Amino acid sequence: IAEFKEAFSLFDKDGDGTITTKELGTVMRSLGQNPTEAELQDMINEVDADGNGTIDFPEFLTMMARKMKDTDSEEEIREAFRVFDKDGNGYISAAELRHVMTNLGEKLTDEEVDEMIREADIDGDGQVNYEEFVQMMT
Ligand SMILES: [Ca+2]
Ligand SMILES: [Ca+2]
Ligand SMILES: [Ca+2]
Numbered sequence: 001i002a003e004f005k006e007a008f009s010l011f012d013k014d015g016d017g018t019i020t021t022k023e024l025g026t027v028m029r030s031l032g033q034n035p036t037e038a039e040l041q042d043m044i045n046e047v048d049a050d051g052n053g054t055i056d057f058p059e060f061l062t063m064m065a066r067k068m069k070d071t072d073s074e075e076e077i078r079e080a081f082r083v084f085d086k087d088g089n090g091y092i093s094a095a096e097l098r099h100v101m102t103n104l105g106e107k108l109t110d111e112e113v114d115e116m117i118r119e120a121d122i123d124g125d126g127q128v129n130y131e132e133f134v135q136m137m138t
């Protein structure tokens with residue numbers, strides 16, 4: 001929380017308790033991004049729960065708690081995908097899947113693992129990439 005309040009303190013350049021689009025802009029610029037006023041206003045609006053035009057700590061903390069929880073769940077889905085992607089090439093092959101499933105207690109045939117890939121293989125390249133992996137978890 002204090003880590004999140006500490007982050008808040010860097011955005012609030014003048015310490016009045018709120019983050020304006022200009023203050024957000026100043027930070028983003030120090031991060032190697034130079035968004036247009038248009039973009040900056042979208043970013044504020046996305047977080048500005050009471051609509052008053054600026055972001056306060058409770059608004060900031062609330063978005064960060066979701067972003068943390070979203071980030072935690074992606075890190076963990078990413079962990080699972082690597083486990084399946086044995087050679088690490090970013091695609092899960094029929095053979096890696098079959099092999100990892102046997103490790104998961106499920107001795108499957110080439111036909112069964114082939115159907116499992118096809119059900120997941122949106123782009124049709126005979127394998128499962130990370131995007132397709134997340135969809136069939138979903
Ligand atoms: Ca301020
Ligand atoms: Ca607000
Ligand atoms: Ca692979």
Ligand SMILES: [Ca+2]
Binds near residue numbers: 132
């Ligand atoms: Ca595919």
